[PDB]
Ligand binder design. Structure first.
Ligand SMILES: *P(=O)(O)OCC(C)(C)[C@@H](O)C(=O)NCCC(=O)NCCS
Lengths: 72, 49, 50, 135, 134
DNA sequence: TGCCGTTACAATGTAACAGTGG
DNA sequence: CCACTGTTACATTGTAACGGCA
C-alpha cells in the first residue's frame, strides 16, 4: 500500500529502522537525512509512484506525515 | 511546437535515466551502510585520502 | 613459537592491508561517482521542470 | 582503446576460459602427444592462483587456433563488464519469431542502421502518432 | 502434450544436464555426507549409455530441490529440439539497447501483446503510414 | 494440482564489420 | 599495411513465471 510503500522508500533511502519511521518522524532531526539525503529521498519517492512534484511543493515536504500527505 | 514537446520528452527520458541511476546508487549505498554495522566503516573503509 | 607467531602476525597484517586497499578504493570511487551524477542530475531536473 | 585494461582481472578471465575449454574436451594445447598435453594442462591448473603466469603459459602451450577466439571473448567480456555498471549502457536479450525477425532485419538492412535504431524509428513514429493525437 | 517424448533422447539429455551441473559444483545428490554424494556421482558417471537406469538413478538419488529446474530445462530442450527442424518455427535472438527495450516492453505490457506481436504491429503501422503518405 | 507449451529474459561465446593508432 | 578494440548480430543453454488442460 501507499502508506507502507512510503516506509519502504524512506527506510531504504535513509537506512533507518522501520520502527523509527513513524508518521510524524521528521527526516532531518529524527531520521538524520541531510540536504543531499533528503534530495535523494524525494527523488526515490517520485520514482516509486512514477509521478512528479513541483520544486517548492516538494521542498515543503519535511516529514513522513507530510510525505504521505503529498503522496496520498 | 510539437517538436518542442518532443524535445521535452527526450529531456524527460534523460532525466528519468539519471534519477533512476542516482536512486539505485543511493539505495545500494544505504544497504551497504546498514550491512557494515560491524563498525568496520568508521575509518577502515571510508579512507578520505 | 617465534616462527609461528611471526607467521600469524604477517598473515594478519597482509590480509588486513590488502583487503582494505581492495575495498576502500571502489567504495570511494562509488561515493565520488554518486556525487558527480547527482550534480549532473540537478541541471536536467531544473531544465525539464522549466 | 576506450575501456581500461586491468591485468589482474583479464588474466583470471583468460585462465577461466582455458579451463572451461579444456573441461569441455577441446584441445587447448598445441601438443599432439598425450603426455606433454596432460602435463601442460596440469601446469595450467596449478596456475589457478597465479593469473600473471597464465600469459606465459599461453605463449608456451596455447593452441595456435585459439588466439582469435581468445582476443574476441576477453574483449567482449571487458566491454560487458564495464557496461554492466549502469543500466542505460546495458543490453537486453530477446527472442523473435523467424517471420518477425526476417521483416525487421530486411527493414534495417534497407535503412542501413542497426536493429535498435530501426526499433527506435518504428516506436518513434508510433509515438509521434500518439503525440499528435494527444497534442 | 504437443511434442512426442523419446526416451533414449530425453534420458541422454538428463544425463548430460546432471553431469554439467556436477561439473559446475551444484549438489546433484541429496546426501550431505561427502562419501555418499561421491559414490552416487560415480554411479551416474559410469551409468552413461543408459536411459532405463538413469531414470531410476534420478528417482533414487536426485536432489529434491533440483527436480523442478531439471523438468523445465528438459521442457525447453524438447520444444527447441523439435522446433529447430524448420526455419519458420525457429527463434532469432538479438540484443537491444536498454532504452529501446524499455520503450518496447512498455508498449508490449500496455497493449497486452508479446514482443514479436508488438514488432509485427509496429511494422504494419509503419507500412500503413507509408501507404497513407504514398 | 502437476505436466506441458510458451515467453522473456541472463550469461557467455563468436563471427563480422568499423574504428583507431603505430 | 598491420594489429588491436569496440560494437552488433546472432547462437546456445538455463530459468522463472503464465496460462492451458486432464
Ligand atoms: P545541501 O545543503 O547540500 O543542499 C543541496 C541543494 C538543496 C542545494 C541541492 O540539492 C539543490 O536543490 N540544488 C538546486 C537548487 C535549485 O533550485 N536550482 C535551480 C535548478 S538548477
Amino acid at each position: 500500500t501507499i502508506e507502507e510503500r512510503v516506509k519502504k522508500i524512506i527506510g531504504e533511502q535513509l537506512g533507518v529502522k522501520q520502527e523509527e519511521v513513524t508518521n510524524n518522524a521528521s527526516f532531518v532531526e529524527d531520521l538524520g537525512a541531510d540536504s543531499l539525503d533528503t534530495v535523494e529521498l524525494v527523488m526515490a519517492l517520485e520514482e516509486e509512484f512514477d509521478t512528479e512534484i513541483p520544486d517548492e511543493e516538494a521542498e515543503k515536504i519535511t516529514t513522513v506525515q507530510a510525505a504521505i500527505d503529498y503522496i496520498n | 511546437m510539437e517538436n518542442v514537446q518532443k524535445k521535452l520528452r527526450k529531456l524527460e527520458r534523460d532525466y528519468y535515466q539519471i534519477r533512476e541511476q542516482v536512486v539505485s546508487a543511493k539505495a545500494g549505498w544505504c544497504a551497504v551502510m546498514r550491512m557494515v554495522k560491524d563498525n568496520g566503516v568508521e575509518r577502515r573503509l571510508h579512507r578520505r585520502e | 613459537a617465534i616462527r609461528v607467531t611471526q607467521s600469524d602476525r604477517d598473515l594478519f597484517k597482509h590480509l588486513i592491508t590488502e583487503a582494505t586497499s581492495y575495498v576502500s578504493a571502489d567504495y570511494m570511487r562509488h561515493a565520488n561517482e554518486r556525487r558527480t551524477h547527482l550534480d549532473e542530475a540537478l541541471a536536467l531536473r531544473g531544465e525539464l521542470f522549466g | 582503446m576506450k575501456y581500461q585494461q586491468l591485468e589482474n582481472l583479464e588474466c583470471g578471465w583468460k585462465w577461466a576460459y582455458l579451463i572451461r575449454k579444456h573441461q569441455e574436451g577441446e584441445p587447448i594445447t598445441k601438443y599432439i602427444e598425450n603426455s606433454a598435453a596432460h602435463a601442460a594442462v596440469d601446469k595450467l591448473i596449478k596456475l589457478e592462483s597465479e593469473p600473471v603466469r597464465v600469459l606465459e603459459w599461453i605463449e608456451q602451450h596455447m593452441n595456435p587456433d585459439l588466439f582469435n577466439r581468445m582476443k574476441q571473448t576477453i574483449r567482449a567480456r571487458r566491454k560487458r563488464h564495464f557496461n554492466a555498471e549502469h543500466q542505460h549502457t546495458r543490453k537486453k536479450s530477446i527472442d523473435l519469431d523467424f517471420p518477425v525477425w526476417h521483416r525487421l532485419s530486411a527493414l534495417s538492412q534497407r535503412r542501413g542502421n542497426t536493429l535498435s535504431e530501426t526499433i527506435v524509428q518504428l516506436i518513434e513514429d508510433a509515438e509521434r502518432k500518439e503525440k499528435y493525437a494527444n497534442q
